[PDB]
PDB file of C-alpha atoms and ligand atoms in Angstrom:
ATOM      1  CA  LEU X   1      -8.373 -33.657  31.509  1.00 23.87           C
ATOM      2  CA  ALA X   2     -10.886 -32.655  28.864  1.00 22.20           C
ATOM      3  CA  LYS X   3      -9.352 -30.872  25.915  1.00 22.62           C
ATOM      4  CA  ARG X   4      -9.720 -27.099  26.143  1.00 21.96           C
ATOM      5  CA  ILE X   5     -10.634 -24.524  23.504  1.00 21.45           C
ATOM      6  CA  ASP X   6      -9.093 -21.091  24.137  1.00 19.98           C
ATOM      7  CA  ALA X   7      -9.904 -17.788  22.456  1.00 19.94           C
ATOM      8  CA  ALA X   8      -7.088 -15.249  22.268  1.00 19.63           C
ATOM      9  CA  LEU X   9      -7.824 -11.536  22.039  1.00 20.42           C
ATOM     10  CA  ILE X  10      -5.012  -9.262  20.901  1.00 20.53           C
ATOM     11  CA  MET X  11      -5.481  -5.764  22.255  1.00 20.60           C
ATOM     12  CA  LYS X  12      -4.215  -2.209  22.244  1.00 22.61           C
ATOM     13  CA  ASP X  13      -5.415   0.797  24.242  1.00 22.75           C
ATOM     14  CA  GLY X  14      -8.259  -1.328  25.579  1.00 25.68           C
ATOM     15  CA  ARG X  15      -9.577  -2.256  22.114  1.00 27.08           C
ATOM     16  CA  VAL X  16      -9.631  -5.613  20.355  1.00 23.30           C
ATOM     17  CA  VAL X  17      -7.154  -5.211  17.510  1.00 20.16           C
ATOM     18  CA  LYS X  18      -9.224  -5.640  14.310  1.00 21.74           C
ATOM     19  CA  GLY X  19     -12.433  -6.301  16.237  1.00 21.08           C
ATOM     20  CA  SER X  20     -14.763  -9.117  15.255  1.00 24.26           C
ATOM     21  CA  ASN X  21     -17.744  -9.842  12.986  1.00 23.77           C
ATOM     22  CA  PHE X  22     -20.355 -10.498  15.675  1.00 25.17           C
ATOM     23  CA  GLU X  23     -23.041  -8.006  14.557  1.00 29.13           C
ATOM     24  CA  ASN X  24     -25.133  -8.796  17.638  1.00 29.64           C
ATOM     25  CA  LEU X  25     -22.654  -6.914  19.876  1.00 30.08           C
ATOM     26  CA  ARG X  26     -22.949  -3.266  20.890  1.00 27.56           C
ATOM     27  CA  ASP X  27     -19.205  -2.890  20.260  1.00 30.06           C
ATOM     28  CA  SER X  28     -17.539  -5.750  18.442  1.00 27.85           C
ATOM     29  CA  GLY X  29     -14.158  -4.271  19.459  1.00 26.91           C
ATOM     30  CA  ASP X  30     -14.917  -4.235  23.192  1.00 29.27           C
ATOM     31  CA  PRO X  31     -12.846  -7.021  24.790  1.00 29.86           C
ATOM     32  CA  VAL X  32     -15.182  -7.466  27.750  1.00 32.24           C
ATOM     33  CA  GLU X  33     -18.325  -7.791  25.643  1.00 32.77           C
ATOM     34  CA  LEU X  34     -16.609 -10.047  23.097  1.00 32.19           C
ATOM     35  CA  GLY X  35     -15.069 -12.243  25.795  1.00 35.26           C
ATOM     36  CA  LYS X  36     -18.347 -12.493  27.652  1.00 35.75           C
ATOM     37  CA  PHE X  37     -19.992 -13.680  24.441  1.00 33.14           C
ATOM     38  CA  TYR X  38     -17.305 -16.312  23.883  1.00 32.51           C
ATOM     39  CA  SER X  39     -17.822 -17.497  27.438  1.00 32.67           C
ATOM     40  CA  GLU X  40     -21.521 -17.929  26.690  1.00 32.26           C
ATOM     41  CA  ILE X  41     -21.117 -19.917  23.455  1.00 31.96           C
ATOM     42  CA  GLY X  42     -18.561 -22.438  24.692  1.00 30.51           C
ATOM     43  CA  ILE X  43     -15.025 -21.038  24.906  1.00 31.67           C
ATOM     44  CA  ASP X  44     -13.270 -22.656  27.829  1.00 29.29           C
ATOM     45  CA  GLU X  45     -10.613 -20.030  28.572  1.00 31.70           C
ATOM     46  CA  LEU X  46      -9.779 -16.542  27.367  1.00 27.39           C
ATOM     47  CA  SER X  47      -6.274 -15.184  26.791  1.00 28.57           C
ATOM     48  CA  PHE X  48      -5.747 -11.452  26.447  1.00 31.27           C
ATOM     49  CA  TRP X  49      -2.487 -10.320  24.840  1.00 35.25           C
ATOM     50  CA  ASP X  50      -1.736  -6.609  25.110  1.00 37.40           C
ATOM     51  CA  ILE X  51       0.436  -4.433  22.841  1.00 34.42           C
ATOM     52  CA  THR X  52      -0.294  -0.920  24.083  1.00 37.64           C
ATOM     53  CA  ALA X  53       2.412   1.851  24.303  1.00 37.15           C
ATOM     54  CA  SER X  54       4.783   1.907  27.281  1.00 34.14           C
ATOM     55  CA  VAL X  55       3.350   5.037  28.897  1.00 31.48           C
ATOM     56  CA  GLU X  56      -0.226   3.933  29.152  1.00 30.06           C
ATOM     57  CA  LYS X  57       0.408  -0.024  29.135  1.00 33.02           C
ATOM     58  CA  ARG X  58       0.515  -0.989  32.803  1.00 33.87           C
ATOM     59  CA  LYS X  59      -2.604   0.939  33.774  1.00 35.25           C
ATOM     60  CA  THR X  60      -4.357  -0.257  30.624  1.00 34.50           C
ATOM     61  CA  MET X  61      -3.648  -3.921  31.353  1.00 34.75           C
ATOM     62  CA  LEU X  62      -4.797  -3.591  34.961  1.00 33.20           C
ATOM     63  CA  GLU X  63      -8.035  -1.889  33.868  1.00 32.13           C
ATOM     64  CA  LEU X  64      -8.665  -4.619  31.287  1.00 33.86           C
ATOM     65  CA  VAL X  65      -8.144  -7.362  33.874  1.00 38.24           C
ATOM     66  CA  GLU X  66     -10.371  -5.540  36.354  1.00 39.23           C
ATOM     67  CA  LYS X  67     -13.168  -5.063  33.810  1.00 39.26           C
ATOM     68  CA  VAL X  68     -12.887  -8.687  32.584  1.00 40.99           C
ATOM     69  CA  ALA X  69     -12.943 -10.180  36.066  1.00 41.19           C
ATOM     70  CA  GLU X  70     -16.225  -8.384  36.875  1.00 40.76           C
ATOM     71  CA  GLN X  71     -18.280  -9.719  33.965  1.00 43.45           C
ATOM     72  CA  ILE X  72     -16.644 -13.022  32.940  1.00 45.43           C
ATOM     73  CA  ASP X  73     -16.814 -16.296  34.837  1.00 45.09           C
ATOM     74  CA  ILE X  74     -14.381 -18.598  33.028  1.00 46.41           C
ATOM     75  CA  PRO X  75     -10.618 -18.674  33.632  1.00 45.55           C
ATOM     76  CA  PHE X  76      -8.577 -16.111  31.747  1.00 41.87           C
ATOM     77  CA  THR X  77      -4.934 -15.249  31.199  1.00 43.47           C
ATOM     78  CA  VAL X  78      -3.198 -11.961  30.463  1.00 42.85           C
ATOM     79  CA  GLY X  79       0.091 -11.408  28.701  1.00 41.82           C
ATOM     80  CA  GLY X  80       2.142  -9.104  26.541  1.00 40.82           C
ATOM     81  CA  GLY X  81       5.341  -7.521  27.826  1.00 40.28           C
ATOM     82  CA  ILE X  82       5.136  -8.914  31.350  1.00 36.97           C
ATOM     83  CA  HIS X  83       8.782  -8.433  32.346  1.00 38.19           C
ATOM     84  CA  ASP X  84       8.957  -8.971  36.098  1.00 41.60           C
ATOM     85  CA  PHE X  85       7.318 -10.437  39.162  1.00 43.36           C
ATOM     86  CA  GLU X  86       5.688  -7.225  40.373  1.00 44.84           C
ATOM     87  CA  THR X  87       3.896  -6.720  37.044  1.00 45.50           C
ATOM     88  CA  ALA X  88       2.653 -10.331  36.991  1.00 45.47           C
ATOM     89  CA  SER X  89       1.563 -10.165  40.634  1.00 45.13           C
ATOM     90  CA  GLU X  90      -0.490  -7.018  40.278  1.00 45.81           C
ATOM     91  CA  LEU X  91      -2.304  -8.464  37.225  1.00 48.62           C
ATOM     92  CA  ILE X  92      -3.162 -11.732  39.051  1.00 51.06           C
ATOM     93  CA  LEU X  93      -4.319  -9.861  42.151  1.00 49.16           C
ATOM     94  CA  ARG X  94      -6.463  -7.574  40.051  1.00 48.39           C
ATOM     95  CA  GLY X  95      -8.243 -10.674  38.724  1.00 52.45           C
ATOM     96  CA  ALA X  96      -6.325 -12.677  36.121  1.00 57.09           C
ATOM     97  CA  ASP X  97      -6.071 -16.415  36.808  1.00 57.61           C
ATOM     98  CA  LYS X  98      -2.750 -16.839  34.942  1.00 57.33           C
ATOM     99  CA  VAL X  99      -0.054 -14.799  33.234  1.00 56.02           C
ATOM    100  CA  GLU X 100       1.638 -15.621  29.924  1.00 50.99           C
ATOM    101  CA  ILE X 101       5.372 -14.826  29.766  1.00 53.04           C
ATOM    102  CA  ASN X 102       7.846 -15.450  26.951  1.00 52.20           C
ATOM    103  CA  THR X 103      10.818 -13.142  26.390  1.00 53.25           C
ATOM    104  CA  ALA X 104      11.323 -12.232  30.051  1.00 55.72           C
ATOM    105  CA  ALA X 105      11.298 -15.892  31.053  1.00 57.79           C
ATOM    106  CA  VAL X 106      13.884 -16.791  28.395  1.00 56.07           C
ATOM    107  CA  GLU X 107      16.163 -14.018  29.638  1.00 58.98           C
ATOM    108  CA  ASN X 108      15.540 -14.839  33.285  1.00 62.52           C
ATOM    109  CA  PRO X 109      14.191 -18.343  33.826  1.00 63.52           C
ATOM    110  CA  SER X 110      14.023 -17.771  37.577  1.00 64.23           C
ATOM    111  CA  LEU X 111      11.077 -15.445  36.829  1.00 61.84           C
ATOM    112  CA  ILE X 112       8.975 -18.625  36.302  1.00 61.13           C
ATOM    113  CA  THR X 113       9.936 -19.836  39.758  1.00 60.77           C
ATOM    114  CA  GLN X 114       9.378 -16.413  41.336  1.00 60.64           C
ATOM    115  CA  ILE X 115       5.795 -16.182  40.049  1.00 58.43           C
ATOM    116  CA  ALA X 116       5.068 -19.836  40.846  1.00 59.20           C
ATOM    117  CA  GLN X 117       6.360 -19.474  44.433  1.00 62.11           C
ATOM    118  CA  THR X 118       3.622 -16.980  45.298  1.00 64.86           C
ATOM    119  CA  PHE X 119       0.852 -17.933  42.863  1.00 64.37           C
ATOM    120  CA  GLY X 120       1.412 -21.625  42.114  1.00 63.30           C
ATOM    121  CA  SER X 121       2.594 -23.266  38.913  1.00 63.26           C
ATOM    122  CA  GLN X 122      -0.951 -23.123  37.587  1.00 64.21           C
ATOM    123  CA  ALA X 123      -0.700 -19.319  37.412  1.00 63.69           C
ATOM    124  CA  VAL X 124       2.373 -19.448  35.100  1.00 63.71           C
ATOM    125  CA  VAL X 125       1.987 -20.065  31.362  1.00 64.18           C
ATOM    126  CA  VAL X 126       5.173 -19.932  29.294  1.00 63.04           C
ATOM    127  CA  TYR X 127       4.548 -19.032  25.677  1.00 64.96           C
ATOM    128  CA  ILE X 128       7.235 -20.591  23.492  1.00 64.54           C
ATOM    129  CA  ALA X 129       7.546 -19.221  19.990  1.00 65.14           C
ATOM    130  CA  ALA X 130       9.565 -21.694  17.951  1.00 62.27           C
ATOM    131  CA  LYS X 131      10.668 -22.177  14.364  1.00 64.16           C
ATOM    132  CA  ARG X 132      12.740 -24.625  12.336  1.00 62.33           C
ATOM    133  CA  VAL X 133      16.282 -23.392  11.670  1.00 61.03           C
ATOM    134  CA  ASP X 134      18.730 -25.683   9.840  1.00 59.37           C
ATOM    135  CA  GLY X 135      16.592 -28.683  10.732  1.00 56.31           C
ATOM    136  CA  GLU X 136      16.261 -27.981  14.478  1.00 59.46           C
ATOM    137  CA  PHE X 137      13.459 -26.372  16.496  1.00 59.16           C
ATOM    138  CA  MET X 138      14.771 -23.118  17.976  1.00 59.05           C
ATOM    139  CA  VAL X 139      13.231 -20.693  20.468  1.00 59.93           C
ATOM    140  CA  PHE X 140      12.524 -17.110  19.362  1.00 59.48           C
ATOM    141  CA  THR X 141      11.979 -14.025  21.527  1.00 55.99           C
ATOM    142  CA  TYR X 142      10.934 -10.405  20.908  1.00 58.32           C
ATOM    143  CA  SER X 143       7.877 -11.271  18.875  1.00 59.86           C
ATOM    144  CA  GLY X 144       9.774 -13.692  16.660  1.00 59.07           C
ATOM    145  CA  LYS X 145      12.573 -11.238  15.870  1.00 61.41           C
ATOM    146  CA  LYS X 146      15.382 -12.963  17.816  1.00 64.31           C
ATOM    147  CA  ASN X 147      16.748 -16.467  17.370  1.00 61.82           C
ATOM    148  CA  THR X 148      17.973 -17.195  20.860  1.00 59.97           C
ATOM    149  CA  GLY X 149      19.988 -20.203  19.745  1.00 59.66           C
ATOM    150  CA  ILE X 150      18.204 -22.210  22.463  1.00 58.40           C
ATOM    151  CA  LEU X 151      16.781 -25.522  21.283  1.00 59.93           C
ATOM    152  CA  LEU X 152      13.096 -26.067  21.885  1.00 60.42           C
ATOM    153  CA  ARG X 153      13.936 -29.452  23.328  1.00 60.71           C
ATOM    154  CA  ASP X 154      16.078 -27.817  25.942  1.00 60.95           C
ATOM    155  CA  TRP X 155      13.816 -24.901  26.826  1.00 63.44           C
ATOM    156  CA  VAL X 156      10.760 -27.154  27.372  1.00 66.92           C
ATOM    157  CA  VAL X 157      12.657 -29.211  29.918  1.00 67.33           C
ATOM    158  CA  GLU X 158      13.941 -26.114  31.716  1.00 70.52           C
ATOM    159  CA  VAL X 159      10.489 -24.483  31.758  1.00 73.35           C
ATOM    160  CA  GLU X 160       9.035 -27.470  33.552  1.00 74.41           C
ATOM    161  CA  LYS X 161      11.977 -27.654  35.969  1.00 69.25           C
ATOM    162  CA  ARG X 162      11.557 -23.977  36.850  1.00 68.44           C
ATOM    163  CA  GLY X 163       7.902 -24.465  37.828  1.00 68.39           C
ATOM    164  CA  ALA X 164       5.676 -23.488  34.902  1.00 67.30           C
ATOM    165  CA  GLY X 165       2.113 -24.834  34.843  1.00 68.00           C
ATOM    166  CA  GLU X 166       1.518 -24.894  31.113  1.00 69.32           C
ATOM    167  CA  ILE X 167       3.333 -24.274  27.809  1.00 68.73           C
ATOM    168  CA  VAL X 168       1.972 -22.572  24.682  1.00 70.93           C
ATOM    169  CA  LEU X 169       3.669 -23.818  21.528  1.00 72.02           C
ATOM    170  CA  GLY X 170       3.392 -21.029  18.996  1.00 76.28           C
ATOM    171  CA  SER X 171       4.731 -22.141  15.620  1.00 77.43           C
ATOM    172  CA  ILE X 172       6.142 -19.091  13.881  1.00 75.86           C
ATOM    173  CA  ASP X 173       6.265 -21.340  10.772  1.00 79.32           C
ATOM    174  CA  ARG X 174       2.411 -21.211  10.782  1.00 78.01           C
ATOM    175  CA  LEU X 175       1.781 -17.555  11.573  1.00 76.32           C
ATOM    176  CA  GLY X 176      -0.701 -16.087   9.172  1.00 77.15           C
ATOM    177  CA  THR X 177      -1.417 -19.440   7.550  1.00 78.60           C
ATOM    178  CA  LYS X 178      -4.564 -21.517   7.648  1.00 79.87           C
ATOM    179  CA  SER X 179      -2.953 -24.866   6.869  1.00 79.19           C
ATOM    180  CA  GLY X 180      -3.259 -26.344  10.349  1.00 78.37           C
ATOM    181  CA  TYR X 181      -1.401 -26.325  13.598  1.00 80.85           C
ATOM    182  CA  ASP X 182       2.214 -27.468  13.613  1.00 77.34           C
ATOM    183  CA  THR X 183       1.462 -31.037  14.681  1.00 73.83           C
ATOM    184  CA  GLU X 184       5.047 -32.196  14.056  1.00 76.45           C
ATOM    185  CA  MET X 185       6.191 -29.572  16.557  1.00 74.88           C
ATOM    186  CA  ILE X 186       3.534 -30.660  19.076  1.00 77.96           C
ATOM    187  CA  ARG X 187       4.512 -34.319  18.682  1.00 79.59           C
ATOM    188  CA  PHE X 188       8.188 -33.453  19.131  1.00 79.52           C
ATOM    189  CA  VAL X 189       7.437 -31.676  22.429  1.00 81.18           C
ATOM    190  CA  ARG X 190       4.836 -34.070  23.877  1.00 82.47           C
ATOM    191  CA  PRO X 191       7.259 -36.726  25.224  1.00 82.65           C
ATOM    192  CA  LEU X 192       9.572 -34.088  26.746  1.00 85.47           C
ATOM    193  CA  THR X 193       7.119 -32.642  29.271  1.00 84.73           C
ATOM    194  CA  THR X 194       4.265 -33.643  31.536  1.00 89.69           C
ATOM    195  CA  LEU X 195       2.801 -30.134  31.377  1.00 87.11           C
ATOM    196  CA  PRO X 196      -0.338 -29.184  29.469  1.00 86.53           C
ATOM    197  CA  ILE X 197       0.539 -28.138  25.928  1.00 87.39           C
ATOM    198  CA  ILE X 198      -1.481 -25.408  24.245  1.00 88.74           C
ATOM    199  CA  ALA X 199      -1.352 -25.268  20.433  1.00 86.84           C
ATOM    200  CA  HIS X 200      -1.161 -21.868  18.739  1.00 87.28           C
ATOM    201  CA  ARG X 201      -0.863 -20.646  15.134  1.00 87.70           C
ATOM    202  CA  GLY X 202      -2.075 -22.175  11.881  1.00 84.06           C
ATOM    203  CA  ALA X 203      -5.701 -23.033  12.614  1.00 83.56           C
ATOM    204  CA  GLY X 204      -8.053 -22.567   9.661  1.00 86.65           C
ATOM    205  CA  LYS X 205     -10.831 -25.174  10.026  1.00 85.16           C
ATOM    206  CA  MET X 206     -12.335 -27.382  12.716  1.00 87.74           C
ATOM    207  CA  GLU X 207     -10.424 -30.428  11.537  1.00 87.97           C
ATOM    208  CA  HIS X 208      -7.153 -28.712  12.511  1.00 85.32           C
ATOM    209  CA  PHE X 209      -8.289 -28.792  16.126  1.00 84.14           C
ATOM    210  CA  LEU X 210      -8.783 -32.554  15.956  1.00 83.20           C
ATOM    211  CA  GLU X 211      -5.333 -32.985  14.388  1.00 80.96           C
ATOM    212  CA  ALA X 212      -3.708 -30.989  17.192  1.00 81.57           C
ATOM    213  CA  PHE X 213      -5.432 -33.016  19.895  1.00 82.47           C
ATOM    214  CA  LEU X 214      -4.281 -36.233  18.255  1.00 83.39           C
ATOM    215  CA  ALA X 215      -0.750 -34.797  18.261  1.00 82.51           C
ATOM    216  CA  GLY X 216      -0.945 -34.477  22.030  1.00 85.93           C
ATOM    217  CA  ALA X 217      -2.072 -30.896  22.702  1.00 88.81           C
ATOM    218  CA  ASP X 218      -4.221 -30.389  25.762  1.00 89.45           C
ATOM    219  CA  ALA X 219      -5.659 -27.103  24.537  1.00 87.49           C
ATOM    220  CA  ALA X 220      -5.957 -25.265  21.290  1.00 86.21           C
ATOM    221  CA  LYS X 221      -5.772 -21.493  21.129  1.00 87.59           C
ATOM    222  CA  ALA X 222      -6.952 -19.378  18.211  1.00 87.01           C
ATOM    223  CA  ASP X 223      -8.087 -15.895  17.477  1.00 85.53           C
ATOM    224  CA  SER X 224      -8.948 -14.587  14.016  1.00 85.60           C
ATOM    225  CA  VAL X 225     -10.671 -17.836  12.982  1.00 81.41           C
ATOM    226  CA  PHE X 226     -13.151 -17.196  15.797  1.00 78.02           C
ATOM    227  CA  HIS X 227     -13.313 -13.372  15.574  1.00 76.66           C
ATOM    228  CA  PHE X 228     -13.930 -13.351  11.812  1.00 78.13           C
ATOM    229  CA  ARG X 229     -16.314 -16.322  12.121  1.00 76.63           C
ATOM    230  CA  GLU X 230     -14.486 -18.812   9.901  1.00 76.40           C
ATOM    231  CA  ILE X 231     -15.147 -21.298  12.701  1.00 73.84           C
ATOM    232  CA  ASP X 232     -18.174 -21.213  14.989  1.00 73.26           C
ATOM    233  CA  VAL X 233     -17.282 -22.155  18.531  1.00 72.66           C
ATOM    234  CA  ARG X 234     -20.266 -24.320  19.221  1.00 71.35           C
ATOM    235  CA  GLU X 235     -19.965 -26.073  15.842  1.00 70.70           C
ATOM    236  CA  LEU X 236     -16.336 -26.727  16.707  1.00 69.70           C
ATOM    237  CA  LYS X 237     -17.209 -28.223  20.039  1.00 69.78           C
ATOM    238  CA  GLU X 238     -19.928 -30.430  18.577  1.00 71.25           C
ATOM    239  CA  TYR X 239     -17.545 -31.528  15.838  1.00 71.45           C
ATOM    240  CA  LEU X 240     -14.818 -32.511  18.324  1.00 71.58           C
ATOM    241  CA  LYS X 241     -17.200 -34.412  20.557  1.00 73.79           C
ATOM    242  CA  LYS X 242     -18.625 -36.263  17.545  1.00 73.05           C
ATOM    243  CA  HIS X 243     -15.141 -37.464  16.650  1.00 69.38           C
ATOM    244  CA  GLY X 244     -14.234 -38.768  20.076  1.00 66.40           C
ATOM    245  CA  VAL X 245     -12.480 -35.777  21.721  1.00 69.94           C
ATOM    246  CA  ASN X 246     -13.358 -35.124  25.366  1.00 69.77           C
ATOM    247  CA  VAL X 247     -14.469 -31.475  25.225  1.00 68.81           C
ATOM    248  CA  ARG X 248     -17.063 -29.789  27.443  1.00 69.98           C
ATOM    249  CA  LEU X 249     -20.505 -28.943  26.036  1.00 70.79           C
ATOM    250  CA  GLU X 250     -23.431 -27.179  27.716  1.00 65.79           C
TER     251      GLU X 250
HETATM  252  N1  6VP C   1      -1.159 -16.189  23.583  1.00 67.34           N
HETATM  253  C1  6VP C   1      -0.534 -15.559  22.958  1.00 67.34           C
HETATM  254  C2  6VP C   1       0.178 -14.695  22.073  1.00 67.34           C
HETATM  255  C3  6VP C   1       1.566 -14.531  22.083  1.00 67.34           C
HETATM  256  C4  6VP C   1       2.169 -13.687  21.177  1.00 67.34           C
HETATM  257  N2  6VP C   1       3.474 -13.474  21.110  1.00 67.34           N
HETATM  258  O1  6VP C   1       4.535 -14.221  22.125  1.00 67.34           O
HETATM  259  O2  6VP C   1       3.950 -12.491  19.997  1.00 67.34           O
HETATM  260  C5  6VP C   1       1.384 -12.984  20.285  1.00 67.34           C
HETATM  261  C6  6VP C   1       0.026 -13.139  20.283  1.00 67.34           C
HETATM  262  C7  6VP C   1      -0.570 -13.997  21.173  1.00 67.34           C
HETATM  263  O3  6VP C   1      -1.901 -14.179  21.212  1.00 67.34           O
END
């Protein structure tokens, strides 16, 4: 398929954490208005990742999904503390196209299969946060706090066997950097799975998107580079098409 450009919005209490620099918006911290804008300038998919407090979280995530589904017409995912099938199901039914799961899937891989049984593999995105430890790629849970001791190589294979539709490869080694996506990590995973690979963490300039697609990613996800306008989405898409990448333009 065409390569995909994804914008991720981190949220809390219904607000975009740290907003954005788009002065043309009524509320640059409103996820619906920001995501609608991205959908108009060439983002292919939106991912919303929620970190609100336990009490208000479930109702907050459902309201977000509901509000997004009304105004936005591109596919979108939702994630952040989705721990079980009933939570994932109610978010998809309320309007999300896919859910992103990480820690809960590592602790119970059958959760992938559960969700896929009812909603299809295409509704299940497994986010894999990985880091080099003593020379080997290991899987981390709990927002990067826990080395599971599971090898990336092994978790990828299991994720596909259990029925996931896509994998996000979040390189903890690149969090908060602008040096590029972890293309070595992407290239290590690419031969192990037939699933779409989404690159995450490290992007700082448009060239990094090209590098990740050459490494074998099928989609590239980023957030702050777009929200703080270090990279313009339509410039990025024109750049990638110029250099031979099959992306979608208007
Ligand atoms: N997608 C995604 C995503 C995942 C995590 N995470 O597994 O901490 C954090 C932020 C994100 O945007």
